[PDB]
Amino acid sequence: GSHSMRYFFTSVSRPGRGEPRFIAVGYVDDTQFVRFDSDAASQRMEPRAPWIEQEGPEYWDGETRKVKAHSQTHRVDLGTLRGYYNQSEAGSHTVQRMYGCDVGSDWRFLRGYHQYAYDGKDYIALKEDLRSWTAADMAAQTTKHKWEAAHVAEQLRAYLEGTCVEWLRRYLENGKETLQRTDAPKTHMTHHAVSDHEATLRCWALSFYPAEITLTWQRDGEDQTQDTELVETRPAGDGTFQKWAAVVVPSGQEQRYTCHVQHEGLPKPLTLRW
C-alpha cells in the first residue's frame, strides 16, 4: 500500500520563568525515526531508528538547525496568539503543528498536509489543493491574510510535493528491511466465564505492523456489533502493535461466533472460533 512521512510538534508555555517546552517527532508510517526535546541535554535532533544513523553529520546539523528554527517560530507564535486572543501572561498555553506527505504504492506524490492548533483547537490548516487555507476563526483569518501576502503556501507546496517525497523514498529505501516489511497478527482467543449463564470471548491480535487493523465478530456468518468491545490499538513497545475485541455470549453457545481479522500482512483474512 501507501506510505507517509509526518512531523509532529508541540510547544507549551511556562509563564513563571524561562522559555517553552518544545518536543518534535518524525514518523515514517508507524515508525518514529527522529526527535527533539528542548528539555534534553543534547539540544540536537536525535535518531530513534537504526536506518537513520546511516546519515552523516551534515544531515544532523541541518536537521538540528531547522528543528530550532521551528522551536523559535512556536515560541513567537505563543506570544502572538496570546495577544490575538487577549490572554494574560499567567496561563500556560499549547501550540501544536502537524505536517507531512503521502505517497501510494508506486511511491509517487499523493497528498500533503499542514495543520496548526492553539490550546487543542483547529487554528489554521493548508487545504488539499496546497494553494489555500482554512482559518477556523478571525484570529486565524489575520494569519491567513499575512500568509497569502507572503506566499507561504507556495513554499510549503514546493516542500510537500518535492523534497518531502524525495526524502521519504530515500528513507523507505534505506529502511527497507523494516519499513517495507509487514508483520502479520499473531492471533489467539481467550474465554472468561462471568457466571453460569454468561461467557466473554476475546480475540487478540499481537505483534503486527503497520497499526491499521480491523477486528470484527460474526454470529452464524452475519456481522454482530451488539455486546462487543473493541479497544484502541496500542503499541507493544518493540515497534509493533496490539488490539483485542470481545463479545459477550450465552454460555454453551461459543461455537456460533467467529472473529475476523483483516491486516495488510495477511494474504487471506483470518477466522478464529472457540
Binding site: 512531523y7 518524525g26 531547522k66 528543528v67 528554527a69 521551528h70 507564535d77 502572538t80
Partner: peptide, 9 residues
C-alpha cells in the same frame, strides 16, 4: 527531512 522554513504567524 524537515521543512527548511517555518514562517511565523
Amino acid at each position: 527531512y524537515l521543512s527548511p522554513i517555518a514562517s511565523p504567524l
